[PDB]
Write a protein that binds this ligand. Structure first.
Ligand SMILES: CC1(COc2ccc3c(c2)ncn3-c2ccc3cccc(N4CCC(N)CC4)c3n2)COC1
Ligand SMILES: [Cl-]
Ligand SMILES: [Cl-]
Ligand SMILES: [Cl-]
Ligand SMILES: [Cl-]
Ligand SMILES: [Cl-]
Ligand SMILES: [Cl-]
Ligand SMILES: [Cl-]
Length: 338
């Protein structure tokens, strides 16, 4: 019945107390985005939620670079409320505002006139990261070119470092735009062709009510296992809090899809342990260096945590130099599209 909104920060008071977030309705939609309905063909349903669904699709003429293009389409169910339509429009405005990045699922086009609203997004071949890791759990054994391509081989530490680097980059981009994700987790990361990490959100395509990851508090659902202490207790959300989420996410990556705080249910006892300063032990496939990154992200003092930009730098040093070169070419190819 809900989704967690990405918040973009318009301004912060000199004291550091009053935060003003942009109002999506206030922002302006760009008509250039509009794509003719006839030019879009809808396929199989990628996901289904009580109020919405994601569908496979092909867009014709949408892109000069890819005249026939595989894509994913976001649409509301008839069940969706009048207010919810607003949410889709809001998503369009915010996404246009942020602009495009290689590491986030991107908005390609939208159909908003004389029809059910349709959001066109990049199509990711591998699906969500959690499922992908589980699928490749077995056959995983502890060159750089192979990593940034579709060649299939047993999953490697190198692959994990790549996913680790891409999420940092995607997050760095979001932070630069003063955008706070508030629900960063492997479930919200999808993998595209070429093993390119794309960051997304839980959405209306799947049911938050039916997901164990979220605890419902008040009128909202919270991914407590991924929340920074300030968020849980002080209800404060920032780029720094996201960093905490990034560390939890890394734990998910190095445990091959493992649930954080395994064997621990979220309860009063869990909250107390976090206040105590309790942190997760090293994951099985995590190197000492990677675990160190997770621990830094989990610092009690948010200002103490590393910036996403710093994290990208740290991860890069743990990757062969050719990986960085490959990322750069892919980044440039991505910005050259169309
Ligand atoms: C043929 C396969 C194809 O799978 C897929 C799945 C989702 C795919 C996809 C290919 N391209 C894109 N998206 C998207 C895109 C935006 C999303 C925005 C919010 C939420 C999403 N999701 C992610 C998947 C989840 N099961 C439902 C909600 C989104 N998904 C099966 O994996 C390969
Ligand atoms: Cl959003
Ligand atoms: Cl096909
Ligand atoms: Cl583990
Ligand atoms: Cl080690
Ligand atoms: Cl820093
Ligand atoms: Cl940051
Ligand atoms: Cl960088």
């Amino acid at each position: 019945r809900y989704e967690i909104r990405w918040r973009v920060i318009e301004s912060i008071s000199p004291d550091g107390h009053e935060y003003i977030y942009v109002d999506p309705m206030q922002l302006p939609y760009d008509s250039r985005w509009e794509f003719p309905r006839d030019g879009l063909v809808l396929g199989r349903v990628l996901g289904s939620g009580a109020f919405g669904k994601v569908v496979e699709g092909t867009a014709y003429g949408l892109s000069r670079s890819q005249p026939v293009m595989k894509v994913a389409v976001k649409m509301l169910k008839p069940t969706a409320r009048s207010s919810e339509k607003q949410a889709l429009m809001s998503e369009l405005k915010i996404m246009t505002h942020l602009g495009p990045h290689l590491n986030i699922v991107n908005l390609l086009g939208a159909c908003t006139k004389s029809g059910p609203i349709y959001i066109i997004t990049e199509y990711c071949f591998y699906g969500d990261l959690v499922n992908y890791l589980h699928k490749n759990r077995d056959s995983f054994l502890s060159v750089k070119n192979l990593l940034s391509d579709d060649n299939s081989e047993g999953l490697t530490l190198l692959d994990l470092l790549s996913f680790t680097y891409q999420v940092a980059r995607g997050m760095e981009f979001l932070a630069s735009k003063n955008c706070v994700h508030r629900d960063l987790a492997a479930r919200n990361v999808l993998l595209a062709q070429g093993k390119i990490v794309k960051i997304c959100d839980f959405g209306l395509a799947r049911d938050i009510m039916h997901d164990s990851n979220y605890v419902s508090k008040g009128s909202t659902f919270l991914p407590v296992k991924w929340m920074a202490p300030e968020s849980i207790f002080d209800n404060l959300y920032t780029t720094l809090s996201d960093v905490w989420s990034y560390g939890i996410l890394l734990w998910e990556i190095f445990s091959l899809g493992g649930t954080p705080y395994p064997g621990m249910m979220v309860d009063s006892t869990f909250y107390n342990k976090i206040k105590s300063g309790y942190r997760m032990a090293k994951p099985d496939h995590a190197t000492s260096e990677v675990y160190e990154i997770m621990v830094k992200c989990w610092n009690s003092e948010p200002e103490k945590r590393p910036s996403f930009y710093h994290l990208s730098e740290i991860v890069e040093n743990l990757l062969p130099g050719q990986y960085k070169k490959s990322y750069e070419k892919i980044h440039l190819d991505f910005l050259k599209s169309d």
